[PDB]
Enzyme design. Sequence first.
Site: not given
Ligand code: EH9
Ligand code: ZN
Length: 349
Positions: A12, A14, A211, A214, A235, A292
Amino acid sequence: TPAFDKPKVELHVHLDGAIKPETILYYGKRRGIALPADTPEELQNIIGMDKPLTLPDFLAKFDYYMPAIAGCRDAIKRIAYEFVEMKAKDGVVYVEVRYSPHLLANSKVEPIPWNQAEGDLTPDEVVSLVNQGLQEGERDFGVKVRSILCCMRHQPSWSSEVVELCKKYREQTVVAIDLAGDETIEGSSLFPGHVQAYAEAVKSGVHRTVHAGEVGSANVVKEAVDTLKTERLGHGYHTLEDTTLYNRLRQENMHFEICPWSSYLTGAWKPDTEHAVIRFKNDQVNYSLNTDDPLIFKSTLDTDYQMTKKDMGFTEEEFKRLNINAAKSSFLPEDEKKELLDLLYKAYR
Ligand SMILES: CCCCCC[C@H]([C@H](C)O)n1cnc2c(N)ncnc21
Ligand SMILES: [Zn+2]
């Protein structure tokens, strides 16, 4: 000294939350894009956080640096490549990196993201670009890498492209679909655009993760499991508020993608209660530890292992176990899943 100095598995994390400040600054200056600071160190201070933030304050973090990478082919491919190198320094042998291809595009994408001006980079190319970075990265750094495309809870109109993207680029690093974004958006789990995309994922054998749990209630988790037919939970901390859902999920050996440090900084977890992972441990639950967003949480995989070791009495036997489960729960073809398992076994024993 590393809390767990052995090979690790991460499911997990991003891509857009795991970029080098330097790289952000580099493209920020090279393509004239306004940026809060101009010094890597100060940049991470503003982007990083050490105290819970409102959704808005949190979201804003992305408007900051995303316009710098989004739309630029060079940058898309680069952060992908540089992310593998970051993982190698973590001692990670296999990792599933996720991101929303539409969030890095400036062409196609209906509501063009980040107030970005219409460009030429479509979501489809974003994916292929990322595939190359991740692939060259694997080659050069020794880390097995697969990817997961995210659907956004607030934009069901993208979900079908997402599943078609996973279908068109499978094997080619893309192994699954995900759902990220505001969990409090009423009914979002059931938006026809989302449910159909996951339904298609099932029709096409595209692994599913979501997701849920959380911040939203156990019901958000339920919908994820029963309607979207997810196989893994991002989560899923609030699953504990519904013992029958929890008991059942334990029964079915469901996988929980846990982000300790992340939960603490976002507020998803209040330091007054016993962290949800502690009970997952005591309950011999199928789960893994993840970062994350190293960028926003100013961390590294170790950060999370340090947190559970120091503040939660996590032993080594536990770390090896949870990592074994991470491998077992990977979206790798059985074929290659067994190969990952042997690596870890011969390395842990
Ligand atoms: C408020 C989020 C909008 C832009 C999202 C960018 C990105 C992607 C979805 O990987 N992302 C990175 N960490 C994220 C997180 N904890 N929750 C939601 N989206 C996330
Ligand atoms: Zn995440």
